[PDB]
Amino acid sequence: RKRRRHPS
Amino acid sequence: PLESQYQVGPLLGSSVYSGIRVSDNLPVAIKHVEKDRISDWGELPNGTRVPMEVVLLKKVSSGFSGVIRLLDWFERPDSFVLILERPEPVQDLFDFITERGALQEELARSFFWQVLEAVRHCHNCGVLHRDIKDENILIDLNRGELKLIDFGSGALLKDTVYTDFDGTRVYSPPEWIRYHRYHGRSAAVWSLGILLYDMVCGDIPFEHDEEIIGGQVFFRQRVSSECQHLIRWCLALRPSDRPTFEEIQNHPWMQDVLLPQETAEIHLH
Numbered sequence: 096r097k098r099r100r101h102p103s
Numbered sequence: 104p105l106e107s108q109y110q111v112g113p114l115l116g117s118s119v120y121s122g123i124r125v126s127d128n129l130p131v132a133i134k135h136v137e138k139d140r141i142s143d144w145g146e147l148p149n150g151t152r153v154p155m156e157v158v159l160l161k162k163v164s165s166g167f168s169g170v171i172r173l174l175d176w177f178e179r180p181d182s183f184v185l186i187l188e189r190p191e192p193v194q195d196l197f198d199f200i201t202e203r204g205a206l207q208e209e210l211a212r213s214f215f216w217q218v219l220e221a222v223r224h225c226h227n228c229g230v231l232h233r234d235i236k237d238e239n240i241l242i243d244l245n246r247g248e249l250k251l252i253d254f255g256s257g258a259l260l261k262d263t264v265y266t267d268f269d270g271t272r273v274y275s276p277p278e279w280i281r282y283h284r285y286h287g288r289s290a291a292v293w294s295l296g297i298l299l300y301d302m303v304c305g306d307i308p309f310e311h312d313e314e315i316i317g318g319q320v321f322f323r324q325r326v327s328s329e330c331q332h333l334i335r336w337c338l339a340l341r342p343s344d345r346p347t348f349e350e351i352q353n354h355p356w357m358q359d360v361l362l363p364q365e366t367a368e369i370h371l372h
């Protein structure tokens with residue numbers, strides 16, 4: 096499963 | 104004179120550079136912020152007009168704590184430059200969880216406890232971080248100590264309603280998604296529930312607005328019933344139903360935490 100950062 | 108007081112190294116991310124204080128070879132991080140991009144401005148005790156991030160960092164940077172401390176700052180024509188602590192070796196908690204997967208509950212307990220103490224410190228100093236997430240937590244791998252970073256979305260803590268927010272949406276609470284309103288402490292507790300799930304399951308629970316407001320937490324990893332209860336309590340849809348920081352740290356799952364040095368030797372070294 097894709098795990099990603101999330102910009103503020 | 105910052106160009107003469109610090110030796111500038113390579114980028115750390117973005118604009119933050121690795122650096123060294125020429126005066127004593129202290130490792131530092133050098134953060135540059137363009138004035139044009141600063142939306143939130145504050146005033147220092149001296150009346151000097153500085154970005155709010157400087158105001159907040161100064162308030163939390165006195166004494167020891169689980170926050171990356173501000174050592175100095177400079178104003179340039181079109182930017183501000185912030186001199187920050189740079190412990191080494193470090194890895195941020197996002198990369199740590201990516202590389203290692205779901206964390207053992209003993210390790211998640213130690214990490215979560217340290218984050219709670221750091222957030223309590225901020226609140227005691229009158230500062231609301233507003234962007235608690237694994238990306239904004241550094242792990243000192245030798246000392247087993249966690250450090251909060253990036254106060255660029257923060258605010259002075261108040262007891263009245265907030266109607267602005269520029270943190271990370273997938274960590275933001277349903278009252279923000281629904282009504283564009285939240286209170287500081289209960290919104291922080293929500294993001295802490297997101298973070299705890301992230302640690303014990305290997306990724307955050309919600310990606311879409313409908314999941315945030317839905318109020319259903321599916322556990323994709325084996326997690327103890329005590330830990331599930333704490334997470335679900337932090338992620339109560341109604342803000343007034345969420346625990347206080349005292350109730351979190353008194354929760355049964357949080358007892359018998361490892362010391363930082365024990366954490367490093369057992370799990371990091």
Ligand SMILES: O=C(Nc1cccc2ncccc12)c1cccnc1
Binds near residue numbers: 132189190195255
């Ligand atoms: O304080 C920050 N960064 C850091 C400080 C010190 C060390 C770091 N080591 C590794 C990676 C980041 C580091 C930061 C990052 C993003 C936005 N605002 C601030």
